Design a protein around this ligand. Structure first.
Ligand SMILES: O=c1ccn([C@H]2C[C@H](O)[C@@H](COP(=O)(O)NP(=O)(O)OP(=O)(O)O)O2)c(=O)[nH]1
Ligand SMILES: O=c1ccn([C@H]2C[C@H](O)[C@@H](COP(=O)(O)NP(=O)(O)OP(=O)(O)O)O2)c(=O)[nH]1
Ligand SMILES: O=c1ccn([C@H]2C[C@H](O)[C@@H](COP(=O)(O)NP(=O)(O)OP(=O)(O)O)O2)c(=O)[nH]1
Ligand SMILES: [Mg+2]
Ligand SMILES: [Mg+2]
Ligand SMILES: [Mg+2]
Lengths: 160, 160, 160
C-alpha cells in the first residue's frame, strides 16, 4: 500500500465483464496493461471484428489511452488492429473495443474469451490550440532542415 | 479568450486548402483533432492512396505529431493507414498526407473531400541521445524481469 | 560535448550487429531514429517477416520505445508493421525486431541489410495504477460530453 511512484497515475476501471482479470502489465516497467477478449471470435484471413474487452476506463483529462497490438500474435498469426493505435479519449466512458484483423493470407485466427489480445498504454497528450497562420514565415518560424521533406526524402531504401 | 490550460500548447497551422474547416476535437478532452481529406478518393480493396489533408502544421520542437486512424471507419469499412501512426516531425513544414488503405476484402471505400479521415495527436517525445555500450551489464544496468523476453513470451493465447 | 537539451534522455544501445550504423534522426527535431535491417528479406504480397535490427536498447523505466513505420516505404511499396506501433518495454533487453508486412497486393518488397526500415521513438508513459470501481458515477466522475460515444459517433463520413 505504500507509494514508493509518488506521481504515478490512477486509472478508474469498470469491469463490465467481471469474469475477466483486471488488465495487468506482464513485467514491471512494461508500457501497457494487457486487455482481454470478452468473447470468442474467429477471424478468417482478411476479416476484422470489433471485439469487446469487458472494461471501461476513465483516461484522465490531458491523457490518452492507446490500444496497441501485441507483438507475439502479430508475428505468429498475423493479428493486427485496424485502427492501431486505438485512441481512447479522456471523455470516453464506454467499453473499450478492439478492431482485430487477421492479416495472415491463409490461416484463421481463433480468439478465446480470456485471451490477451491487445495492450493499453496511457500517455499524456498535448491538447493543442491551433493558431492559423497564412504562412510559417509570417508566423516568424525559422526554416528547418527538414523543410517540406517527407515521404522517404531521406532515402534508406532502393524504392525511395 | 481567457486561458483558464495555462501550459497548453499552440500549434501553428496553415490551411493549404482554405475550403476545409480547421481540424477540431470531436469532444472536449479528445486526444486528437480530426484531419479532413482535401480530395475525393476511391480505394478498391487492398489499395492505398496518399491523401492530402489541406493542412500544414509546425509541431513544436520536442514534440511529435501523430496521425492515427479513426475507429469508426476502421471497423465499419476497414479503413486504415499504412504507416500508422504517421509520424509528423517537428521540422516538417509540408502538407500532412495520409496513407489510407482499404483493408476490406471486397467493398471499396469512397472518401469525399471534407470527410474526416484521420486524427492528429501531438505529444512530447524524448530526443534521445544514444549511448553505445558493449553490453548492458557493462553499462551497470540491473537485470530486469523481462530480460530478453518478447514476441509473446508472456503467453495469453494458444499460439504463443 | 556541451549539453546546450539539459534534460534530454540517454538511451543505452548495444549494436548486436556492429556492421550497421547507429540509428539516427534524419533531421534535427525528428521524432525517431531510424532502425536498420540487419538482414536481407523479400516479402511477397501479404507476407510478413520478423526482421532483426541489430540493436538492443534500454528504454528508461517510465518510458516506452515505439517502433513506427516509415512513411515513404508505406506509400511507395505498401510496407507496414503488423504490430505498429511496436511497443518496446523498459525492461526489454533483447534485440528489437520489426514485424514487417507487405500490404501491396502484387509487388514484392525487397529489404536489404542496411536499409532503414522503421523508426524508433521514445516517449514517457504513465505506469497506471488501476482503481476498480463499480461505476464511474460511483467514483464521483462527472459525466462527459463524449459519454460512451465511439466508433464513428461524431460522423464525418457517409458510412458512419
Ligand atoms: O503520416 C504521415 C507521416 C509522415 N508525413 C510527413 C511528415 C514527416 O515529418 C515526414 C517524414 O515522415 P517519416 O519519417 O515517417 N517518413 P520517411 O522516413 O519515409 O521520410 P524521410 O526520409 O523524409 O524521413 O513525412 C506525413 O505527411 N504523413
Ligand atoms: O515491435 C516490437 C515490439 C515488441 N518487441 C519486443 C520488446 C517488447 O518489450 C517485447 C514484448 O512486446 P509486446 O508486449 O508488444 N508483445 P507480447 O505481449 O506478445 O510479448 P510479451 O508476452 O513478451 O509481453 O517484445 C520488439 O522487439 N519489437
Ligand atoms: O481502439 C479503439 C479506439 C477507440 N475506441 C472508443 C474510445 C474513443 O474515445 C472513441 C472514439 O475513437 P476515435 O475517435 O478513434 N474514433 P471515431 O472518430 O470514429 O469516433 P468518434 O466519431 O466517436 O470520435 O472510440 C475504442 O473503444 N477502441
Ligand atoms: Mg506484452
Ligand atoms: Mg474521433
Ligand atoms: Mg523519416
Amino acid at each position: 500500500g505504500l507509494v514508493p511512484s509518488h506521481m504515478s497515475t490512477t486509472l478508474a476501471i469498470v469491469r463490465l465483464d467481471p469474469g475477466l482479470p483486471l488488465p495487468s502489465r506482464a513485467h514491471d516497467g512494461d508500457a501497457g496493461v494487457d486487455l482481454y477478449s470478452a468473447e470468442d471470435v474467429e477471424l478468417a484471413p482478411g476479416r476484422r471484428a470489433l471485439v469487446r474487452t469487458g472494461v471501461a476506463v476513465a483516461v484522465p483529462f490531458g491523457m490518452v489511452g492507446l490500444v496497441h497490438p501485441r507483438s507475439g500474435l502479430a508475428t505468429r498469426v498475423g493479428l493486427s488492429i485496424v485502427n492501431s493505435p486505438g485512441t481512447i479519449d479522456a471523455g470516453y466512458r464506454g467499453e473499450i473495443k478492439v478492431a482485430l484483423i487477421n492479416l495472415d493470407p491463409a490461416a484463421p485466427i481463433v480468439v478465446h474469451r480470456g485471451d490477451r489480445i491487445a495492450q493499453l498504454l496511457v500517455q499524456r497528450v498535448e491538447l493543442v490550440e491551433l493558431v492559423e497562420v497564412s504562412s510559417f514565415d509570417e508566423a516568424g518560424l525559422a526554416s528547418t532542415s527538414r523543410g517540406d521533406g517527407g515521404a522517404g526524402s531521406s532515402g534508406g531504401h532502393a524504392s525511395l
